[PDB]
Design a protein around this nucleic acid. Structure first.
Ligand SMILES: [Mg+2]
Ligand SMILES: [Mg+2]
Ligand SMILES: [Mg+2]
Ligand SMILES: [Mg+2]
Ligand SMILES: [Mg+2]
Ligand SMILES: [Mg+2]
Ligand SMILES: [Mg+2]
Ligand SMILES: [Mg+2]
Ligand SMILES: [Mg+2]
Ligand SMILES: [Mg+2]
Ligand SMILES: [Mg+2]
Ligand SMILES: [Mg+2]
Ligand SMILES: [Mg+2]
Ligand SMILES: [Mg+2]
Ligand SMILES: [Mg+2]
Ligand SMILES: [Mg+2]
Ligand SMILES: [Mg+2]
Ligand SMILES: [Mg+2]
Ligand SMILES: [Mg+2]
Ligand SMILES: [Mg+2]
Ligand SMILES: [Mg+2]
Ligand SMILES: [Mg+2]
Ligand SMILES: [Mg+2]
Ligand SMILES: [Mg+2]
Ligand SMILES: [Mg+2]
Ligand SMILES: [Mg+2]
Ligand SMILES: [Mg+2]
Ligand SMILES: [Mg+2]
Ligand SMILES: [Mg+2]
Ligand SMILES: [Mg+2]
Ligand SMILES: [Mg+2]
Ligand SMILES: [Mg+2]
Ligand SMILES: [Mg+2]
Ligand SMILES: [Mg+2]
Ligand SMILES: [Mg+2]
Ligand SMILES: [Mg+2]
Ligand SMILES: [Mg+2]
Ligand SMILES: [Mg+2]
Ligand SMILES: [Mg+2]
Ligand SMILES: [Mg+2]
Ligand SMILES: [Mg+2]
Ligand SMILES: [Mg+2]
Ligand SMILES: [Mg+2]
Ligand SMILES: [Mg+2]
Ligand SMILES: [Mg+2]
Ligand SMILES: [Mg+2]
Ligand SMILES: [Mg+2]
Ligand SMILES: [Mg+2]
Ligand SMILES: [Mg+2]
Ligand SMILES: [Mg+2]
Ligand SMILES: [Mg+2]
Ligand SMILES: [Mg+2]
Ligand SMILES: [Mg+2]
Ligand SMILES: [Mg+2]
Ligand SMILES: [Mg+2]
Ligand SMILES: [Mg+2]
Ligand SMILES: [Mg+2]
Ligand SMILES: [Mg+2]
Ligand SMILES: [Mg+2]
Lengths: 394, 129, 60
RNA sequence: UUCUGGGUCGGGGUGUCGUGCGUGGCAGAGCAGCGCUGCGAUCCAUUGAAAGUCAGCCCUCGAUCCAAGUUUUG
RNA sequence: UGAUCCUUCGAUGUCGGCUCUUCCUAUCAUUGUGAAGCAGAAUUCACCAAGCGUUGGAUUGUUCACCCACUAACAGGGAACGUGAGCUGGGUUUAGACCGUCGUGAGACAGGUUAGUUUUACCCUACUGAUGUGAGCCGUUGUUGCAAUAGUAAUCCCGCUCAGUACGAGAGGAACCGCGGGUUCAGACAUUUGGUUCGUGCGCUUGGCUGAGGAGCCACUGGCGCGAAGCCACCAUCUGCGGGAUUAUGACUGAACGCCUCUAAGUCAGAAUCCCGCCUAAAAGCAACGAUAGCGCCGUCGGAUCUCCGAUAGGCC
RNA sequence: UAGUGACGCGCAUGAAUGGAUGAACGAGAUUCCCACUGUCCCUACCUGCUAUCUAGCGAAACCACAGCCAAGGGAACGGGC
RNA sequence: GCAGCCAGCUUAGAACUGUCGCGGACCAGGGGAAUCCGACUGUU
RNA sequence: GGCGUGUUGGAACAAGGCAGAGUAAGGGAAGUCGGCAAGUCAGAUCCGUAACUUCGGGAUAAGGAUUGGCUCUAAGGGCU
RNA sequence: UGAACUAUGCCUGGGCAGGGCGAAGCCAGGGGAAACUCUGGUGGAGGCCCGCCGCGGUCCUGACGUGCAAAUCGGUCGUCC
RNA sequence: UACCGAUUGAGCGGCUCAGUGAGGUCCUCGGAUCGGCGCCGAG
């Protein structure tokens, strides 16, 4: 009664249940272990999946058949506008896990950050943190505020900062900022509270958290596909054509005994929109957002040392279904979970990055900016008009 | 060494014989190095040594098993430089178990993914592209 | 950076699909539209949107 | 829910297809009448034109409207 | 395989395959080892060990065989001899019919052959996902989080180098580190390539229809070519991981037993195992914090009244 | 282990219980080849009608009581013990 | 011996022509080599 | 000439079905008891058609080429 | 008590596109010393072929299987002087 | 020593149906270029 021929199981049981994530934003379930020898730094950041493109770079991989030769690798653009630290929270270690000790918010909290505190912001008197913000001015409030910071330096072992994204600087319809606790893994508790107290209601750019050619982890929710059958959800083999009552099913969902269906039997249900954590995503380029240097708009964040062009990371017509990346972006090798305009939770690696591929220094030679809204054949509009010449619209 | 290419020649694929051995077809019966799956057919790309039988050719060749090597294929495979190359025919040459070909000349081009693994085939390739 | 063998457009190192024949001639194509018309034995000098057409009729 | 904001159009970008109708031609196998004129698939020019392009593309540059009010909670 | 006839004849659907999940180890391979009639290579014996893998085909309805190749290996089994309201009916096992043998015959065959309806779930569980849920309370409501417990995942191979080296008289011929890839699997993803296109997007086109042009429509998507966006393919692309205690085993110190001894007390190294981490889920588990519509406080020991619900009957030494 | 051509002490072939042959014919049984294809490798996408939700309408089979498991014993395979 | 007039519908050939596409929808035999059985058509 | 789509409407476009005999890269029966299924072929014209045979056939055997549109040419009649 | 279904027979009625292969018979022209043959055309026979209606009901072991239906539906298919 | 013989035979070789077709010639074009010097010429 053993199965005739051996075959590995369809799907992994370590991603159960295949349910919709109860949380749209990616959640850091494990921050890197604290190393007090380092300076105080952030360990995570929030980005937004703009879209994908391909680059060209010369690989330096001694021993490979592609060493000293150019490749074309797919990359993902993650628009990462600077986040504003509007709070700090301390955790105390307890024999039943970490526990929220006390949270301190800044005096001035942006309106986009307050929209997160509401479900109906348009018809709500925006009174969140209106009685709390008076602590930073009252004499009795500032004394109690100094005691709360000195209490975190005394009774806490893990200090996290509450930061939100600047949805105002994004093409999204959404105005609600995305709050997130970013754990400080720098040094002493006194150093992390002092660093968090100084960085309150201040912006933190993506270049200060992550570095070039660094492998980071991308946390987020995958793209949802609704209810899918067992052939699409678990990739079970399709039954033959002459199968009565359905061929996209699993034939045997279990033996006679045990007289129950096992949890490991592949069934039909919701596929996609699951929480996932992919690691070893190398940063190919930390872009710079649009800025005025001498009164002129600087949008050369896609030019390389070999292109010397004046094009931005946005392709012709912008990223499809997303918009244009006018802020600082993050170019990650390969693909990442989520749809377009999906909030991505970036995080430093928990592992050590010492392999040949991990510490590989990346030097891009060309960044494709052809229109992804079809078979785009021009990198810039300038060369589209130069190649085609004048049209009738002129 | 060789990077993974798109396989497009499963077992039972009759490919052209691109050498002067006298054979015209190569009926691929299996592929070297294929461990196996419950229902997956052993497929092969260019540069992969396969076990093939001749269907049309000389009688001293069309009833035996011959180690062949695929040099061309119609299935477009991607190279590391982002190039998708495909040929107008699936071709192979009869070789030994060590890479030495039975014939002496090769008609048509030979894929670069095949010329780099088999130097004895690359020497008889009129065009490596 | 190659040029399309049918439309004459400029192909970038990430796009396209090259096609080698038995006679040793390798052709690069921008997209499947230039490739499908090439395999259909269509004359590029008669396809109105190609480079060989605008050069033949002196449209530039 | 008026410091504004949200729609509907329009414009531009983008991409798709492939050179629109009309008009002209000393292009047209010809043929029929009195070089002229008529018929004549196709051809050329206008004209990479025309068409449509978010409804789940991108950007507003303008135009013209819109601002309520379901139920319930200590 | 029998023996038995205990259960089932107001029926428990009957062979095999397909499909799919888990389990057993009496271990083929892989991890760590011991042994040899172990020089190397190969192989054999044995131990911890079921984590992981165990294929594609020809013939036969076949389980079972046999052969072709591939492969680290192509190990053996269970789960109502797994699995028919999952399938498929090839086989067996109705009625048609043929042949052979048998019978006077009707017919028989545990012989062969051909054709022969595979019904029902909307109920309860289980499982898969999807809403919601502690009817009592200054609670309502929101954000950021913690976390018991449960799931759990990676795997194997090749090439280069070591090295033609150790080893061997030769013939032959390794290994560790390192490097570059791949198999199987898992989770994704659409920049690219490929597939799909009733955006019925554009071109063309057959028959017909609106007098014709023009513009269109009709033929359950007329057809064809190309085709955006989406979705999608090891048919494109990206990613897949660290500790702890130890098993087998090899040892330390060291008695019992003046010696010896890995064991008795006490120690060390130690793995595809195990547990955990990473990862997924989030509880009649919980924390911090925000905001709280005439509604609520200290009153100081509020005074004086009506209703319920526990216990307890000095002690938080 | 199929098919075909041979071999025939043929368990148990055989001459109107007809033997042998055979063009043509066959929704007959079987084998092979070419072509062909999603049968498969290995599945994906699109459409219509459904399923789904809704207004109206509105059954039946079935039902001791019922409905979370493991082992135990038991009429030797529990759901209750 | 034909001139005038009238009357169709087919067939063949040629040029030109478009993206080599044209029984463009619709309509509309896959073929070959063999074995067994029954001759065939018909019937159940 | 007849008719409201055949005993109902509305909104969505999940799984899984039924149908469209939808399409599908590369391979082309490796699927399966078995090419089951549908895929190929298809009309017409011009060519070319074997083994075998009861000489009737086999036969549309098999295998080829052509096919649109437009402008012409040629031939095929009747009547006074 | 029933042949209003069906089986067979009898009587009297009704009905079956368009094509294909193309037999006897016939005409004319070639070859031959003659016996006689050859070619073209005509002709339209057949339990002949393709195939619509009709009559049947092969396969999908499709749909359906408390159905539209106590045997139906779709495609495919047999025959159609 | 020849013949018959399934194998749907076959290593073996010639003219040809229909496809595909290098190469040259020719034709229609193309006009990189250098001699005049902004038009005739070679190409
Ligand atoms: Mg925004
Ligand atoms: Mg069935
Ligand atoms: Mg795109
Ligand atoms: Mg199988
Ligand atoms: Mg919109
Ligand atoms: Mg007894
Ligand atoms: Mg029953
Ligand atoms: Mg019973
Ligand atoms: Mg049962
Ligand atoms: Mg054991
Ligand atoms: Mg022993
Ligand atoms: Mg048993
Ligand atoms: Mg069983
Ligand atoms: Mg069952
Ligand atoms: Mg059944
Ligand atoms: Mg069964
Ligand atoms: Mg049967
Ligand atoms: Mg019977
Ligand atoms: Mg039978
Ligand atoms: Mg039958
Ligand atoms: Mg595409
Ligand atoms: Mg028309
Ligand atoms: Mg018109
Ligand atoms: Mg109709
Ligand atoms: Mg149709
Ligand atoms: Mg297409
Ligand atoms: Mg250890
Ligand atoms: Mg020990
Ligand atoms: Mg130890
Ligand atoms: Mg066979
Ligand atoms: Mg025989
Ligand atoms: Mg007898
Ligand atoms: Mg007799
Ligand atoms: Mg007899
Ligand atoms: Mg029959
Ligand atoms: Mg019971
Ligand atoms: Mg015989
Ligand atoms: Mg018969
Ligand atoms: Mg007979
Ligand atoms: Mg009959
Ligand atoms: Mg109606
Ligand atoms: Mg009716
Ligand atoms: Mg569906
Ligand atoms: Mg279908
Ligand atoms: Mg189809
Ligand atoms: Mg295909
Ligand atoms: Mg088979
Ligand atoms: Mg099989
Ligand atoms: Mg069929
Ligand atoms: Mg025949
Ligand atoms: Mg009668
Ligand atoms: Mg017929
Ligand atoms: Mg009929
Ligand atoms: Mg009928
Ligand atoms: Mg029927
Ligand atoms: Mg039949
Ligand atoms: Mg059948
Ligand atoms: Mg049926
Ligand atoms: Mg049903």
């Amino acid at each position: 009664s053993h199965r005739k021929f051996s075959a590995p199981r369809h799907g992994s049981l370590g991603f159960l249940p295949r349910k919709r994530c109860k949380r749209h934003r990616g959640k850091v379930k494990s921050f890197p272990k604290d190393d007090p020898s380092k300076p105080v730094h952030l360990t995570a950041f929030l980005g937004y999946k703009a879209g994908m493109t391909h680059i060209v770079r010369e690989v330096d991989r001694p021993g490979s058949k592609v060493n000293k030769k150019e490749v074309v690798e797919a990359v993902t653009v993650v628009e990462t506008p600077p986040m504003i630290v509007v709070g700090v929270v301390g955790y105390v270690m307890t024999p039943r896990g970490l526990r929220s000790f006390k949270t301190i918010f800044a005096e001035h909290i942006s309106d986009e950050c307050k929209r997160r505190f509401y479900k109906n912001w348009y018809k709500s008197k925006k009174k969140a943190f209106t009685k709390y913000c008076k602590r930073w001015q009252d004499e009795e409030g500032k004394k109690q505020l100094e005691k709360d910071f000195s209490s975190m330096k005394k009774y806490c072992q893990i200090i996290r900062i509450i930061a939100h994204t600047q949805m105002r600087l994004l093409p999204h319809r959404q105005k609600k900022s995305h709050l997130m606790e970013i754990q400080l893994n720098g040094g002493t508790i006194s150093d992390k509270v002092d660093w968090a107290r100084e960085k309150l209601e201040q912006s933190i750019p993506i270049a200060n958290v992550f570095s070039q050619d660094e492998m980071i982890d991308v946390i987020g929710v995958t793209k949802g596909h609704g209810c899918k059958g067992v052939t699409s959800r678990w990739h079970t083999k399709k039954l033959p054509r002459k199968t009565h009552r359905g061929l996209r099913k699993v034939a045997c969902i279990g033996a006679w005994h045990p007289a129950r269906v096992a949890f490991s039997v592949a069934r039909a249900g919701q596929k996609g929109y699951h929480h996932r954590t992919e690691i070893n995503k190398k940063i190919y380029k930390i872009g710079v957002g649009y800025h005025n240097k001498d009164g002129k708009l600087v949008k050369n964040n896609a030019s390389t040392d070999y292109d010397l062009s004046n094009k931005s990371i946005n392709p012709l017509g912008g990223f499809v279904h997303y918009g244009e990346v006018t802020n600082d972006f993050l170019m990650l090798k390969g693909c990442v979970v989520g749809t377009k305009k999906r909030v991505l939770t970036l995080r430093k690696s928990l592992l050590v990055q010492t392999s040949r591929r991990a510490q590989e220094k990346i030097d891009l030679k060309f960044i494709d900016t052809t229109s992804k809204f079809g078979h785009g054949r021009f990198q810039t509009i300038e060369e589209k008009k130069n190649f085609m010449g004048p049209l009738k619209k002129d | 060494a060789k990077f993974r290419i798109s396989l497009g020649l499963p077992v039972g694929a009759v490919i052209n014989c691109a050498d002067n051995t006298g054979a015209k077809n190569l009926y691929i019966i299996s592929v070297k190095g294929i461990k196996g799956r419950l229902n997956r057919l052993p497929s092969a790309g260019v540069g992969d040594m396969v076990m093939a039988t001749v269907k049309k050719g000389k009688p001293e060749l069309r009833k035996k098993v011959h180690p062949a090597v695929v040099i061309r294929q119609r299935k477009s495979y991607r190279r590391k430089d982002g190039v998708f190359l495909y040929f107008e025919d699936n071709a192979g040459v009869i070789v030994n178990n060590k890479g030495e070909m039975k014939g002496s000349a090769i008609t048509g081009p030979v894929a670069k993914e095949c010329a780099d693994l088999w130097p004895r085939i690359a020497s008889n390739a009129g065009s490596i592209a | 950076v190659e040029l399309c063998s049918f439309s004459g457009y400029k192909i970038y190192p990430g796009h396209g699909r090259r096609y080698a024949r038995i006679d040793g001639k390798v052709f690069q194509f921008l997209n499947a539209k230039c490739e499908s018309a090439f395999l259909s034995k269509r004359n590029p000098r008669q396809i109105n949107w190609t480079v060989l057409y605008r050069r033949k009729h002196k449209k530039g």
